[PDB]
């Protein structure tokens, strides 16, 4: 450990075009393994990792019906949200769920998640105590009151401590050949002429897993995270990730700049120059 299981569920209303779009994807750490797509030829819960193709048909059947139930939940919640905020019925809107659990060195629950969002903003979320809710606006206070009265926090907590955590261990055993790996980043600094006065130093990080990494430029101990360009971490497409950070430095002073890479696969953080 530690490890994490996450589902990212999206519904997008399409008035005048048909029923809402609905898609759910499941991730173990930074590895996707399942999906449900309402716009596919045959909408059904299906594997997206090779180590999931050995599950019986009753796994996919039960997961599909749960996904079909949630799709109806999103259709209702989208209409209710439209009403809560007194919005026009002709606009497209988004509702998102994000739920899962974190397990650790000994493979038991660190933290459970039940997060909900409307049009890309926090709506309501289950607190870490797995008992109380945090509502983002007064419309979500209505939701929170209703879910508090019904005791849905106990329903979610039972899932987080039971199904979420026990199935995460099962996934971690099915894909133990690939999921438990730790690929250290291969890092180096490149040189790119820019002007007659300065030059670009680009620090690369390649082929690392998991995706979490820190790239930092410093000038003689002092730090440069204000002045640098830092792209988002991106997937290579083969199961590893990439990232780079660049800085504009004056000609002749490249050796005064150092790039630092922090990663779970790095025993000691790397410090690089050109």
């Amino acid at each position: 450990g530690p490890h994490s299981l996450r589902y990212f569920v999206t519904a997008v209303s399409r008035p005048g075009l048909g029923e809402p779009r609905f898609i759910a994807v499941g991730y173990v750490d930074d590895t996707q393994f399942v999906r449900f797509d309402s716009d596919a030829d045959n909408p059904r819960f299906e594997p997206r990792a090779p180590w999931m193709e050995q599950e019986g048909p009753e796994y996919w059947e039960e997961q599909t019906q749960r996904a079909k139930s949630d799709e109806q939940w999103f259709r209702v919640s989208l209409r209710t949200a439209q009403r809560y905020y007194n919005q026009s019925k002709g606009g497209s809107h988004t509702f998102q769920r994000m739920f899962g659990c974190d397990v650790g060195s000994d493979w038991r629950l660190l933290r459970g998640y039940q997060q909900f969002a409307y049009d890309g903003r926090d709506y309501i979320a289950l607190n870490e105590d797995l008992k109380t809710w945090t509502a983002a606006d007064t419309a979500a206070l209505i939701t929170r009151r209703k879910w508090e009265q019904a005791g849905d926090a106990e329903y979610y907590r039972a899932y987080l401590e039971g199904e979420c955590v026990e199935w995460l261990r099962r996934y971690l055993e099915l894909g133990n050949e690939t999921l438990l790996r730790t690929d250290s980043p291969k890092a180096h600094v490149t040189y790119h002429p820019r002007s007659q006065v300065d030059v670009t130093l680009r620090c690369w990080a390649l082929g690392f897993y998991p995706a979490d990494i820190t790239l930092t430029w410093q000038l003689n101990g002092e730090d440069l995270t204000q002045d640098m360009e830092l792209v988002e971490t991106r997937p290579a497409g083969d199961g590893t990730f990439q990232k780079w950070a660049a800085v504009v430095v004056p000609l002749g002073k490249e050796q005064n700049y150092t790039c630092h890479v922090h990663h779970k696969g790095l025993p000691e953080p790397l410090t690089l120059r050109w």
Binding site: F45, Q63, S77, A81, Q114, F116, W147, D152, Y159, E163
Partner: peptide, 9 residues
């Protein structure tokens, strides 16, 4: 394992 949301907003 997918988690059911028991009640809508």
């Amino acid at each position: 394992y997918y988690s059911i949301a028991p009640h809508s907003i």
